[PDB]
Amino acid sequence: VMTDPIADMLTRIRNANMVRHEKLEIPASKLKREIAEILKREGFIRDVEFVEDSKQGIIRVFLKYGQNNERVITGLKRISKPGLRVYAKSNEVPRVLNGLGIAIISTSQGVLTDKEARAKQAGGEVLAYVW
Amino acid sequence: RRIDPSKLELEERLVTVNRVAKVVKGGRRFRFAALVVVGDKNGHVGFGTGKAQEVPEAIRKAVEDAKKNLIEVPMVGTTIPHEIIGRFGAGNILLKPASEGTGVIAGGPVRAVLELAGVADILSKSLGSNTPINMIRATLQGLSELKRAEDVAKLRGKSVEELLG
């Protein structure tokens, strides 16, 4: 029953990849907009734009698509989940899908990519992996 | 893909062969079934399932069927670029990148198609059903799944080869 908005947004983007619609809407949160900005930096998605309406919402996300068909992301998963806490020391963080994939790791400094996290040497909760 | 050209001869090493029987009124007709796979050891691999009453006919049908299809099989640093999981027919298989000295590590026929890949090293493990056919179809569906990280980097405008490795 709406147990976690972020995992919900992840099944939103994965189903969106499955249905190949140009865009979809999600309810607002700064936690959501920040990591969405991280995906905006990674470039897997073309654009994200919020549209205010009382109270929360509503962000509209535009999926990017390749020049030669093919899904831009071959996989996406949220290792973190309620009822099973997870933690990661700064040196312990995996480099998923080797050099292509990037971690989405919330830290005390904020959400960070695994490269930026390795540079900052800052540990934190691992929100999700995208590849 | 695009397309599937077949312009290079191969030794065409065999992976499996087995007799098969079918009941018919007045007896039991026999037909053989043999799987054979092709690979140039230049990063191209294909598969061929050929059944026939006669063994040369079966292996040659497997040859033409192997000729019918090929896989791009990406290979960065003389090894598969990234780890993958591949279930098929309740036949999962895991593959991982390995150190150059590690050598090829797999089951039989999947080691055969990997030798056809020409790759000098690999981690691999069978899961679920042990039958060779689904192991080959899954391993090669996984090879088809494989793509260079540099290729995906070409697909989008970020930077060439982000993370080191």
Added chain:
Amino acid sequence: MKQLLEAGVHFGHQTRRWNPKMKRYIFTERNGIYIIDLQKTVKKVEEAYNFTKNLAAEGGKILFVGTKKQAQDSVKEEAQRSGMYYVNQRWLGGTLTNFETIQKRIKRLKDIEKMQENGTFDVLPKKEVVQLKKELERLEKFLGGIKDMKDLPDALFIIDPRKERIAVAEARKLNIPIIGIVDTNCDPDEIDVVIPANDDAIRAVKLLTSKMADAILEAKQGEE
């Protein structure tokens, strides 16, 4: 290049049978039948025009599939005008895929055609030549289009992909690009160069195959 006036009577076709995936091609509902968006037709026919213009320089052969009633009548005249090979009635299985067996078929046609005049007649007993003659009559209709081809086509035309979805599946089984008109009940994904327009009308196939045959005759006109 096709003009809008040529599209002026060709608007609309199927309803109820429509595939959702082609909804982008659809403009709006009316009465019952959906109306196709004409501008998108102008774009796809434009790209098809540049593409067909590109094939003529290659010298590549093209197939003209045709099976349906009140549509097959046009492709015959358009093919006789183009000089290109064609299909009059129902497509036979494996004519594209089997290749060599069909080559044996046209070889048999060429053989019996020689049997008509070399003097095979008035030698064999009459019942046998009467049987083989009717068999040749069975040959000429199905093979009248096969007589002009031997190599696998660089591309193939189709009057209705849903009728030919298995043959289209064969061309996809190969690597051959597929030009062809597409209805709302048909799936666009099977055809790399769709032509969203009606086909059940004789004029519907007629004008499109006319503009295509004109583009081919014009592109081939340079020769040299």
Added chain:
Amino acid sequence: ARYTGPSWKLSRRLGISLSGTGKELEKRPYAPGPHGPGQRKKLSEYGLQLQEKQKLRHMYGVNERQFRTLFDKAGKLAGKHGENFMILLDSRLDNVVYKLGLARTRRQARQLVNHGHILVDGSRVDIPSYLVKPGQTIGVREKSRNLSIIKESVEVNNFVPEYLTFDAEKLEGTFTRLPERSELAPEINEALIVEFYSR
């Protein structure tokens, strides 16, 4: 343990003249035993594994546990596995001895080491398996310089390995540098020998 059989027959089991290289094989092209006139049958994969390992083994004559020891100790080493493994096999004293041309075959060279004919850094070493540190000298020792067999070995000429150097006038030579894999050309694959020990 080691030697006790024909050994030449073992090379016949290989089908390859290594080692070698002086085995003729051509004198009896057929495989050893009654089945040799008949066409060869393809070996089972694991049987090909053991055949490959054994094929690498006969040139050295090394014991199973010792060869396995050099193996896993080589694998413990960082870097290329087959390179460190082959150079570990090449680090053995008796291999440097036979490659130095002191003997027609490695086994008698091991016997000459067992006699202690061969000094290391001017010091006698009766153990064939002794590790070869770079820059160490290898000689016939002054007491043993005069022997008909040793001179019979010295009189024969052969091309020197790049990693070693030698002078017959001094009857002495040394291990100048660690061998490259490119320098040696074993008939055996190394990916296959590392393949055998999968676990």
Added chain:
RNA sequence: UGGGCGUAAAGGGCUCGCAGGCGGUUUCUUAAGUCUGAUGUGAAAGCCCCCGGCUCAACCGGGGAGGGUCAUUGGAAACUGG
């Protein structure tokens, strides 16, 4: 980490509900969990790393590494908790 439960073993007959588990968004605060530095200890031997010594090896030794929901203390506020 690393399996399931339509028909192979396997969804409780159904429901009400304590304990328990989980739980929308905005803002501030707290620093429990968490992240990080420093300190104390986690014996030696042994395992691992680089070397030395019994003729090599086993065996033996030098330094380093390794190992705690560990303890003490200074910070980080995004997440979870108050």
